[PDB]
Design an enzyme around this catalytic site. Structure first.
Site, mmCIF file in Angstrom:
data_model
loop_
_atom_site.group_PDB
_atom_site.id
_atom_site.type_symbol
_atom_site.label_atom_id
_atom_site.label_comp_id
_atom_site.label_asym_id
_atom_site.label_seq_id
_atom_site.Cartn_x
_atom_site.Cartn_y
_atom_site.Cartn_z
ATOM 1 C CD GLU A 35 0.605 1.931 -10.229
ATOM 2 O OE1 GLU A 35 1.708 1.573 -10.670
ATOM 3 O OE2 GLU A 35 0.338 1.993 -9.002
ATOM 4 C CG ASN A 46 7.508 -5.549 -9.293
ATOM 5 O OD1 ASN A 46 6.479 -6.176 -9.512
ATOM 6 N ND2 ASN A 46 7.603 -4.265 -9.522
ATOM 7 C CG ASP A 48 8.460 -9.583 -5.969
ATOM 8 O OD1 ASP A 48 8.492 -9.340 -7.184
ATOM 9 O OD2 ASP A 48 7.392 -9.454 -5.338
ATOM 10 C CB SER A 50 6.250 -10.275 -9.323
ATOM 11 O OG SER A 50 6.420 -8.995 -8.694
ATOM 12 C CG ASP A 52 4.184 -3.986 -11.216
ATOM 13 O OD1 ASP A 52 3.847 -4.973 -10.520
ATOM 14 O OD2 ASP A 52 4.721 -2.984 -10.743
ATOM 15 C CG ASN A 59 3.086 -7.955 -8.908
ATOM 16 O OD1 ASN A 59 2.998 -8.931 -8.175
ATOM 17 N ND2 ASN A 59 4.244 -7.482 -9.348
ATOM 18 C CG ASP A 101 -7.197 -8.809 -2.017
ATOM 19 O OD1 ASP A 101 -7.610 -9.980 -1.999
ATOM 20 O OD2 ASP A 101 -6.052 -8.449 -1.631
#
Ligand SMILES: [Cl-]
Ligand SMILES: [Cl-]
Ligand SMILES: [Cl-]
Ligand SMILES: [Cl-]
Ligand SMILES: [Cl-]
Ligand SMILES: [Cl-]
Ligand SMILES: [Cl-]
Ligand code: NA
Length: 129
Positions: A35, A46, A48, A50, A52, A59, A101
């Site tokens: 990562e 990203n 979209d 957003s 990280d 994120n 989650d």
């Protein structure tokens, strides 16, 4: 801060990630390697819109607040900046919620693609733990 492999393994262990939700320490060290290359200050935008953040590239769409991710949630209840700290507590606390989650460590796409199924114990081989 750029962690050494064994240094991060020890910190992750100290912070309660070793076998957290059944994922051995090597899984978490492998995910951090791919990562962030172990750099707490890693950030990546990203498509979209957003971003990280940090050693585990958490994120802003769901997990932290950065003020610039429209429609987003902050389910870890932290500024995304807290994820860039040399102290990994915020990152570990948030990762525990993320791995809880439903999809386990599959939430980290680099984990699924580069760590999952591999000899992850290699990531902690050698380390005083
Ligand atoms: Cl390494
Ligand atoms: Cl392991
Ligand atoms: Cl926002
Ligand atoms: Cl911006
Ligand atoms: Cl929220
Ligand atoms: Cl905030
Ligand atoms: Cl799982
Ligand atoms: Na957010």
């Amino acid at each position: 801060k750029v962690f050494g492999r064994c240094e991060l393994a020890a910190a992750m262990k100290r912070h309660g990630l070793d076998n957290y939700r059944g994922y051995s320490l090597g899984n978490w060290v492998c995910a951090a390697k791919f990562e962030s290359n172990f750099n707490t200050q890693a950030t990546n935008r990203n498509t979209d819109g957003s971003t990280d953040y940090g050693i585990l590239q958490i994120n802003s769409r769901w997990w932290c607040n950065d003020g610039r991710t429209p429609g987003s949630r902050n389910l870890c209840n932290i500024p995304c900046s807290a994820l860039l700290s040399s102290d990994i507590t915020a990152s570990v606390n948030c990762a525990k919620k993320i791995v809880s989650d439903g999809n386990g460590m599959n939430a980290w796409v680099a984990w699924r693609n580069r760590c999952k199924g591999t000899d992850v114990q290699a990531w902690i081989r050698g380390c005083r733990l």
